Amino acid sequence: IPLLLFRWKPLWGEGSLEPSPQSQAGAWKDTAQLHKSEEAVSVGQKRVLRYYLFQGQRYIWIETQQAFYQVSLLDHGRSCDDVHRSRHGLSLQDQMVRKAIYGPNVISIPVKSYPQLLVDEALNPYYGFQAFSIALWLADHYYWYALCIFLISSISICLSLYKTRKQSQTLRDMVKLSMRVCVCRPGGEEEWVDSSELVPGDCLVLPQEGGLMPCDAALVAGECMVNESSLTGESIPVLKTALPEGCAETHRRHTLFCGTLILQARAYVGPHVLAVVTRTGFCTAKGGLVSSILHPRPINFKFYKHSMKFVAALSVLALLGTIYSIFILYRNRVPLNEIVIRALDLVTVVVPPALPAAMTVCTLYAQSRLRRQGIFCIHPLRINLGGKLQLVCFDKTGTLTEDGLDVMGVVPLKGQAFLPLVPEPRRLPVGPLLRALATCHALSRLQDTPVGDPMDLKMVESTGPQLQVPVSVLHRFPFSSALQRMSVVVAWPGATQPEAYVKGSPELVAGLCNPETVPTDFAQMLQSYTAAGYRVVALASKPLPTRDTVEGDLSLLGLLVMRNLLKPQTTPVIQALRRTRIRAVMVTGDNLQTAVTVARGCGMVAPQEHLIIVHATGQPASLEFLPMESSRHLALSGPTFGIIVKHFPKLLPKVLVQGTVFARMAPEQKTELVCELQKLQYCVGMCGDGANDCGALKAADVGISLSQAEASVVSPFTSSMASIECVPMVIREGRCSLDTSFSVFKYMALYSLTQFISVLILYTINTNLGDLQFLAIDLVITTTVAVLMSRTGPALVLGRVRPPGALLSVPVLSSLLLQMVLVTGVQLGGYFLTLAQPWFVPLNRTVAAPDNLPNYENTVVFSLSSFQYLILAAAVSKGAPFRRPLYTNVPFLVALALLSSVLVGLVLVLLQGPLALRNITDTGFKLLLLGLVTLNFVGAFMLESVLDQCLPACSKKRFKQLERELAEQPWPP
């Protein structure tokens, strides 16, 4: 010991590495390229046991000889025979050995009681300044403004208190539940252990009656089709095979995962299925996903990076005022303690102690016009990132196309003729064609709705007959995926013998049909449909007087048509995006030529534009550049994207700058596609809910999830409108809320500084401003203007220009400085003009600062000053490009006008008991004063307009560079 720095911690975290290395001397150290702070160990259970957690992975390594990190399964070069060598459960001695290295199978959360949370939220370097300012004002003033800043801060800490507890309470009501699930023991026992005490080395014998899931296991013996609703999005039973003998990511369909509610539980070898454990709840699939959203990505926005840097220029403009102020305030011979309280007030007048609150009010107003609109947002500062989007990547299942299938009709065939597609199957008369597809099903007529496969529900309502003239006699062959067809034996009254109504895949069934029935125009009609983005099955029949006698030399009646139609409001939106110079992309877990006819329809790839298929081949060979005919775009595939991301990484930025359609994308292959496009220095946006959205959604910058009301397993935008009509009104709520976070920050810097200038042009002559006056100014004119200002509203037409986002650049600084030369000027011009006036008498200087108050210089400086705050506020809020014109903000205009009228009245008339003004001004030059304030109004608006036209005639973001580059030399050679 004797290395504790507690004696130096009682006399006071900018650099965490330069402080922990002095407070503490391979033991309890963790520093490798990322934030260097998780320093603990356990070393229990009479072993080495390198325990330390970082976000849920123990990294079990103290050295390289007898230690190696990445505890997730620890044996990545494993054999598929090894899980077949270990079908039996692990021995009870060894069961409490693997539990000591691995986790306790609970991805838990801390409790985080109130002292704790509070402390964290408060000890931050701004709320210290709101505990130095309140304790400085209370020595004089206060009472009113201090109570108000303290209350506003308390509600600013009690809202983050209850919002952060509810994030923990919602995740606690999630997984880490308890469930008894029997195992196989060391030798043939069950014991019904809990689902949170099994480790890799054991097995699972799952009960077929009920159970949610314990864990992810390798199916050593069995076969099932589990409910995949919470795992891969597809709520249908997904066929999951057993593991063959001889890399569990390659054996995806061979291993069953966590969250799998079992449906079949088919043993087919013996009494019960056997599945041996692979991982544990700490680092498994969906065990890592819940822990991933507990440590989110930081919103690396350059707007906030120049907002915490511009205050640190106001934190040095104070120190060039509180040296001068001491000198002047002493020269006039104050008795001392006031010199100190005064220089300190100057510090609180020029660093605005409620600037944070105004920024929060602007964003709160945001949410309140999205939650009324329909879009639900949970993270407020993500809304500002929505306007600076230059890439929007879409899904297609339930995002652009309709989620479920439908039908255009049947294309029958009577003697090799191809009578055309019927738009509605009730129109053509009754026969074997419409008795078949209305009855060729194995649906469950149960509780008023047939429940089964998605696509075969829609064929029933297409012609819409009654259901129970025929009746379901017997299903001789249930639909398996190996034969790609299903036969239904059915009879009806009025017939002599039943017929074998059968549907199935076109080429595999019609070859089994009669060749005198199927024509030679069967192949050409097939790729006339499936190349236009259609799903197609064929239908046949044969009379019957079981086995496959019902399926042989059939009579192929015709083809059936299925397709995923677009939503009615996804065509005029994709035109609305790429007319505003931001370009859309689809990512797709379906077939390629399905997702090309969508992009030609909705408007990703417009007509009279080129597109090129990329197919590059396992082997590192060439690209082959396949075209299509029907700017520049190019479509590519899933495994093609895996080749050129590794074999050609120097050729990759000339493909993702033009890549529009990404098909066959794996659910993990999407989250680097949304990440390679972030180190090309775009600002991406995901928008889609469906099967495979989960991995790339949080890794994006603005992720919208459709067709769900309120959920927290999401990137922080979750619309409840089920269309991509929301993605304009999220990038239109990041432009009227990022060009508002200028107009509140700028008014604030300008107010602080007009107050600094007045308090200074008025510490000279020893005539400090008075208390009700400062209160009036701050509370009234700055709680009203800021609050009311932040609610103007969004526009109706999206523009080709983006907000700047950088508020240290010349335009902001220049407006502040010019508007300020005009403000100093009006306040000083006023002081000099009040002086040279013939009735004027000077202030009794050799008295004191706040008993020198029924006089004149303070009356003139305070009047010119209040009008200025209101004029600067109206000037710094303009709405021609982005938000809305100002006259639609009725509350504000009414306030500006009423405050302005109370102030004009103070000037031209009586508030002279309060506000400590000069008793009356006799002569009629109160009018020149009013004129100086009019010159200032015209002044501010004109200056701001002239500066708004600032064409400083005197392409670094990578995408821009590439585009120029490609434009010179295209790249699809």
Author numbering: 60 to 71, 113 to 125, 140 to 360, 365 to 582, 610 to 613, 620 to 696, 708 to 779, 784 to 796, ...
What does the article say, verbatim?
To investigate the possible SPM translocation mechanism of ATP13A2, we added SPM, PA, and PI(3,5)P2 during protein purification and sample preparation, and ultimately, we solve the structure of the E2-Pi state at a resolution of 3.6 Å. Comparison between this state and the E1P-ADP state reveals a door sliding motion formed by TM1 and TM2 accompanied by the rotation of the A domain and the tilt of the N domain. The conformational change in TMD creates a spindly negatively charged cavity that allows substrate entry from the lysosomal matrix. The SPM molecule is stabilized by extensive interactions between the amine nitrogen atoms groups from SPM and the acidic and aromatic side chains along the cavity. For instance, the amine nitrogen atoms are coordinated by D254, D463, D960, and D967 via hydrogen bonding interactions and by W251 and F963 via cation–π interactions. In addition, human ATP13A2 contains a narrow tunnel ― formed by TMs 1, 2, 4, 5, 6 ― than that of Spf1, due to the spindly character of the spermine substrate. The binding manner of the SPM substrate in these two structures is highly conserved. The E2P to E2-Pi transition is accompanied by the rearrangement of the A domain and the binding of SPM molecule in lysosomal lumen to the substrate cavity in the TMD of ATP13A2, thereby facilitating the dephosphorylation reaction. Interestingly, the E2P-inhibit state of Ypk9 reveals a long N terminal loop that interacts with the A- and N-domains and hijacks the ATPase in the E2P state. Such an auto-inhibition regulation mechanism is not observed in our current human ATP13A2 structures.
